[PDB]
Amino acid sequence: SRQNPSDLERAIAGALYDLETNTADLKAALRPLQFVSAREIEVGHGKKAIVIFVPVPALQGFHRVQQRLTRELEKKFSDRHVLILAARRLTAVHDAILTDLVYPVEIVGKRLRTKEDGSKVLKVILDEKERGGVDYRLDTYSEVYRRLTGRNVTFEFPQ
Amino acid sequence: EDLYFLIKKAVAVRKHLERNRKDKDSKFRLILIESRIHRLARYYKTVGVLPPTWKYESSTASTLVA
Amino acid sequence: AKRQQDRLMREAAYKKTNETLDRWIETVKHNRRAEHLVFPLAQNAHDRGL
Amino acid sequence: RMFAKPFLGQLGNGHVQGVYSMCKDKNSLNCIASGSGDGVVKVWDLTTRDEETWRVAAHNNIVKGLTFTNDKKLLSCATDGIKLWDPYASPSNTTPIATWQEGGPYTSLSFHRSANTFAASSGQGCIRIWDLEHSTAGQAIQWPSFVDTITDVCFNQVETSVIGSVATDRSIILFDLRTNMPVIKTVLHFACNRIVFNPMEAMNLAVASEDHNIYIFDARNFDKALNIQKGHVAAVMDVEFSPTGEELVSGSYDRTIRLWRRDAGHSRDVYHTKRMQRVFRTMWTMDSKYILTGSDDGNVRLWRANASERSGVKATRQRQALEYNNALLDRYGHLPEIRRIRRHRHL
Amino acid sequence: RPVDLPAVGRMRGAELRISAKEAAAIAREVR
Amino acid sequence: KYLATGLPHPFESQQQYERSLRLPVGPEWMTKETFQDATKPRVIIKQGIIAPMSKPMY
Amino acid sequence: IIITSCVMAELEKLGPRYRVALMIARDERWQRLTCDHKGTYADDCIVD
Amino acid sequence: IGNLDLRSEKQRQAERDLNTALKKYLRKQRKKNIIDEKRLKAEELYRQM
Amino acid sequence: VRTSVLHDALNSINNAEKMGKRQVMIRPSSKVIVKFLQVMQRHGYIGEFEEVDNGKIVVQLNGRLNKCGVISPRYNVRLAELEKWVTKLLPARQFGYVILTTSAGIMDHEEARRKHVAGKIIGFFY
RNA sequence: GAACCUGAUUAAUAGGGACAGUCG
RNA sequence: GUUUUCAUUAAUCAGGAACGUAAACUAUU
Numbered sequence: 001s002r003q004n005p006s007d008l009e010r011a012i013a014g015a016l017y018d019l020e021t022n023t024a025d026l027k028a029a030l031r032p033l034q035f036v037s038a039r040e041i042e043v044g045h046g047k048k049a050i051v052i053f054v055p056v057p058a059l060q061g062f063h064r065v066q067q068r069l070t071r072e073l074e075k076k077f078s079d080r081h082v083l084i085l086a087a088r089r090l091t092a093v094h095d096a097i098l099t100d101l102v103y104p105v106e107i108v109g110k111r112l113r114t115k116e117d118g119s120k121v122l123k124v125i126l127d128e129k130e131r132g133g134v135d136y137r138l139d140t141y142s143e144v145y146r147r148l149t150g151r152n153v154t155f156e157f158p159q
Numbered sequence: 160e161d162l163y164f165l166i167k168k169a170v171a172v173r174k175h176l177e178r179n180r181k182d183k184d185s186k187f188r189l190i191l192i193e194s195r196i197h198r199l200a201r202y203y204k205t206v207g208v209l210p211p212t213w214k215y216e217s218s219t220a221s222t223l224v225a
Numbered sequence: 226a227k228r229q230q231d232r233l234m235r236e237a238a239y240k241k242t243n244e245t246l247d248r249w250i251e252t253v254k255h256n257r258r259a260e261h262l263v264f265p266l267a268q269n270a271h272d273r274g275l
Numbered sequence: 276r277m278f279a280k281p282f283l284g285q286l287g288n289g290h291v292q293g294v295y296s297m298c299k300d301k302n303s304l305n306c307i308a309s310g311s312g313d314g315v316v317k318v319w320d321l322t323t324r325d326e327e328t329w330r331v332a333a334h335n336n337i338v339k340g341l342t343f344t345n346d347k348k349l350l351s352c353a354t355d356g357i358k359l360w361d362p363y364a365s366p367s368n369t370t371p372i373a374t375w376q377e378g379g380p381y382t383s384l385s386f387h388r389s390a391n392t393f394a395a396s397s398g399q400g401c402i403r404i405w406d407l408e409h410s411t412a413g414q415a416i417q418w419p420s421f422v423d424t425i426t427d428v429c430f431n432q433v434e435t436s437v438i439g440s441v442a443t444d445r446s447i448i449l450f451d452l453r454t455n456m457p458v459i460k461t462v463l464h465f466a467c468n469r470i471v472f473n474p475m476e477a478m479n480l481a482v483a484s485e486d487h488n489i490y491i492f493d494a495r496n497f498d499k500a501l502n503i504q505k506g507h508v509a510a511v512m513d514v515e516f517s518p519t520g521e522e523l524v525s526g527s528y529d530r531t532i533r534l535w536r537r538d539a540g541h542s543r544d545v546y547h548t549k550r551m552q553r554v555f556r557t558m559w560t561m562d563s564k565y566i567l568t569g570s571d572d573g574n575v576r577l578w579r580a581n582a583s584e585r586s587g588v589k590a591t592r593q594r595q596a597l598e599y600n601n602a603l604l605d606r607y608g609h610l611p612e613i614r615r616i617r618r619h620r621h622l
Numbered sequence: 623r624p625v626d627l628p629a630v631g632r633m634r635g636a637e638l639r640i641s642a643k644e645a646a647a648i649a650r651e652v653r
Numbered sequence: 654k655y656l657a658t659g660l661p662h663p664f665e666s667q668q669q670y671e672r673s674l675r676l677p678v679g680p681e682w683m684t685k686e687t688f689q690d691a692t693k694p695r696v697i698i699k700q701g702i703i704a705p706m707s708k709p710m711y
Numbered sequence: 712i713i714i715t716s717c718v719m720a721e722l723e724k725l726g727p728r729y730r731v732a733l734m735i736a737r738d739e740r741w742q743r744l745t746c747d748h749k750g751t752y753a754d755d756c757i758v759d
Numbered sequence: 760i761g762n763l764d765l766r767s768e769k770q771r772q773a774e775r776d777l778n779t780a781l782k783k784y785l786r787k788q789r790k791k792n793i794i795d796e797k798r799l800k801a802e803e804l805y806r807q808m
Numbered sequence: 809v810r811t812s813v814l815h816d817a818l819n820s821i822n823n824a825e826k827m828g829k830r831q832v833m834i835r836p837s838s839k840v841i842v843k844f845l846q847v848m849q850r851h852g853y854i855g856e857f858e859e860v861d862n863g864k865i866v867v868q869l870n871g872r873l874n875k876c877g878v879i880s881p882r883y884n885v886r887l888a889e890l891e892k893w894v895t896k897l898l899p900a901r902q903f904g905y906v907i908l909t910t911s912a913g914i915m916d917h918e919e920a921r922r923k924h925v926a927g928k929i930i931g932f933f934y
Numbered sequence: 935g936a937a938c939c940u941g942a943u944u945a946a947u948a949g950g951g952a953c954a955g956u957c958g
Numbered sequence: 959g960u961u962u963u964c965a966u967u968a969a970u971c972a973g974g975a976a977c978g979u980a981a982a983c984u985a986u987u
């Protein structure tokens with residue numbers, strides 16, 4: 001692919017290898033994937049969040065199964081926020097980064113609200129039908145999006 | 160195709176008009192649908208998806224139902 | 226989580242502020258139940274105990 | 276109804292553009308200030324209403340918030356950033372003696388009752404609290420993930436170190452200054468223009484809101500409103516409790532001032548004028564007898580509450596006749612003839 | 623008549639139409 | 654037009670309200686002390702700074 | 712260049728369509744002659 | 760002066776909360792001669808009685 | 809149909825400022841409209857606006873402005889012409905602003921005299 | 935004469951067409 | 959209405975083309 005491993009790339013790749021056997025009885029995108037890419041940069045203070053980059057048809061190949069895959073990737077690996085994303089190299093690319101960030105939940109609207117001077121704040125709203133299990137992940141979403149792109153956005157459920 | 164359905168509606172209107180020959184509302188709708196056909200056909204000519212010498216007056220209607 | 230830790234700390238702050246307004250409930254109750262109120266208050270006078 | 280003559284006067288020549296902020300001095304009795312829309316502020320003395328006492332071309336944009344310190348000095352917000360002046364000095368100084376730009380676009384001010392502390396509501400979703408003479412940037416208290424602007428801010432004057440705020444999330448938020456964090460946040464249905472507290476009951480607050488409505492809330496139980504005053508036509512721009520804590524003024528976005536009792540739920544009086552263009556800021560004097568109205572015509576007007584009650588020293592058989600009439604209307608005010616004549620007002 | 627209406631061209635709604643002579647008339651006045 | 658069309662807000666019964674008014678306020682029918690005590694206003698505002706209350710009274 | 716309070720009163724009594732002329736009149740650099748009479752009628756004020 | 764209009768109070772509370780006589784009823788309402796469906800219900804009641 | 813979506817937006821702003829409303833729903837959005845409202849917000853005639861997406865713009869207005877307008881042929885203007893154009897478009901030189909599509913962007917005439925650049929007259933407010 | 939922009943876009947709160955139950 | 963497609967095809971009318979005894983009181987709101 002692109003990589004020769006770091007300290008944790010081989011660990012996450014060994015997790016993807018170990019999910020084949022000695023477990024379920026579920027594997028569809030597990031065998032056609034290799035070492036891909038990963039990053040470990042902090043979210044908040046004290047906690048970190050692991051992101052893994054994915055080839056661009058394997059994003060829908062991963063949209064096939066992401067329930068309980070990310071649960072076991074959270075539990076069995078390091079007890080931190082696991083997060084998959086496509087790898088890419090403008091505004092359509094950042095839109096793609098947002099809509100592949102929020103994986104169960106479809107974003108609805110973007111409100112780019114200016115202030116009484118030249119400053120402006122973007123705020124993307126989410127879907128109301130899934131609210132309970134995402135709100136503790138929202139600051140991780142915002143911080144990973146800032147760390148990858150540079151644009152401060154804040155995530156909020158509509159009320 | 161939009162043009163295909165429009166010329167199909169045109170042949171249907173002209174066949175009913177040939178059978179009946181007395182009414183004028185079908186003739187007016189025929190004038191509307193032939194103007195619509197010519198406008199969409201001109202846009203598809205200036206794109207170039209179909210031959211620029213292809214024309215529909217009545218013989219193309221006859222040779223596309225035949 | 227940071228949201229839940231913040232929510233518990235701000236619930237504790239809400240209980241403390243409700244205690245420091247429950248110290249005022251009794252005088253608000255007497256002012257609303259009294260028959261004649263005299264303004265300005267005697268405690269706000271610039272010569273209070275002279 | 277015959278001697279109901281509420282308009283008393285107008286402070287000076289007024290402003291050029293409309294009066295978008297004004298603030299009294301809560302320690303003195305005749306010190307008013309008003310900042311207009313072309314960014315000029317004026318300090319008025321209520322004893323000599325013929326001309327202003329001190330004016331300065333303060334900012335560039337409109338003056339959004341304005342307040343008096345507890346010593347003698349006054350503060351003013353803008354989108355420029357907040358500034359501090361000494362309007363009472365033996366030479367007049369136009370230049371400020373402190374300025375603050377960091378902390379986003381500020382919207383409103385509120386000064387502490389006793390100390391030299393004040394809180395400025397900014398547009399970054401935070402309020403920030405300065406103590407004068409030993410703090411430079413202040414401490415920024417915010418709801419943890421908050422983006423929408425905090426429109427108004429108000430120190431509770433009875434219970435010190437409790438700060439209320441409204442925000443364009445149609446929400447009210449509280450703040451405890453003793454443990455520097457927010458406390459509780461409730462989302463209402465429509466946006467609230469202004470929060471204010473009761474100066475005799477420490478826990479009651481009033482929000483003037485774009486629902487044409489005044490909501491009297493209890494700060495301990497935000498479940499339901501203690502009272503809902505509904506009388507307006509356009510949105511309510513400003514609300515202010517009387518210093519006796521039993522009445523309310525609201526200046527609305529149409530051309531009306533509405534005077535309310537605290538338990539009423541409907542208008543005691545309505546004040547209006549063809550010259551008054553809109554109403555933005557209404558506040559009592561510390562007499563609790565006269566109210567002041569900063570309009571969009573550039574005018575600060577001085578009305579009176581209790582429109583038919585004249586001031587000054589009364590003889591005993593004069594004030595006994597007035598008190599006898601008021602008690603008699605309290606008894607027989609609900610009969611049909613008396614009711615229609617006491618409710619008729621020309622709108 | 624309204625006071626606020628400007629003096630160069632006609633105003634329709636929020637659209638102000640200036641004829642080609644009027645923008646030439648201002649350029650003549652400048653020179 | 655001199656009868657009352659409905660009960661006033663705090664009152665719950667016709668006997669309560671029509672028996673609660675019952676006594677003229679005026680100085681012709683009551684003594685001077687009673688007239689003063691019955692037409693004293695509820696809120697008595699004197700002149701001055703009406704500052705918000707510093708400390709709890711009760 | 713002076714403007715009586717009757718003149719300012721009639722400019723204010725005209726509606727918010729005349730807000731620009733009101734601000735132009737309310738320019739600060741001009742003298743404001745306060746009037747001591749009742750009706751605020753600018754013609755009789757100016758003539759008196 | 761100040762006593763209750765009892766009819767008006769009963770109407771206000773209504774708009775807030777919202778075999779020996781039924782023969783002379785028909786004797787009084789056979790004379791109109793409007794048929795008036797309450798009288799149809801009264802005729803069915805008299806037939807049952 | 810008015811292809812001038814800026815003129816449709818400014819017509820809606822003028823209707824709200826006449827009717828005394830406190831916000832609008834500018835239904836077709838753009839970028840020149842956003843720059844126009846950015847200048848109006850710099851000079852304080854409009855409170856706060858947000859672009860939401862299906863998009864449209866919600867414009868909180870203070871109740872301070874009188875009139876918005878677009879100059880429909882968009883005539884080119886130099887600085888020595890800009891002074892006469894300002895004093896012929898505005899009721900007073902100290903009230904209201906003329907909007908310019910310059911090589912430095914979209915700005916008011918005072919910022920154009922600051923940055924020493926001329927351009928086309930696109931609109932005005934006062 | 936739309937917006938978007940230091941190998942094929944927004945899918946338009948402008949179009950034309952298709953299908954279904956219909957309506958006069 | 960749809961869980962429908964090409965993506966400027968469009969707006970306006972110079973020229974032209976199809977249908978054909980009476981009158982008499984009057985961006986929103």
Ligand SMILES: [Zn+2]
Nearest residue numbers: 715717746756
């Ligand atoms: Zn005069």
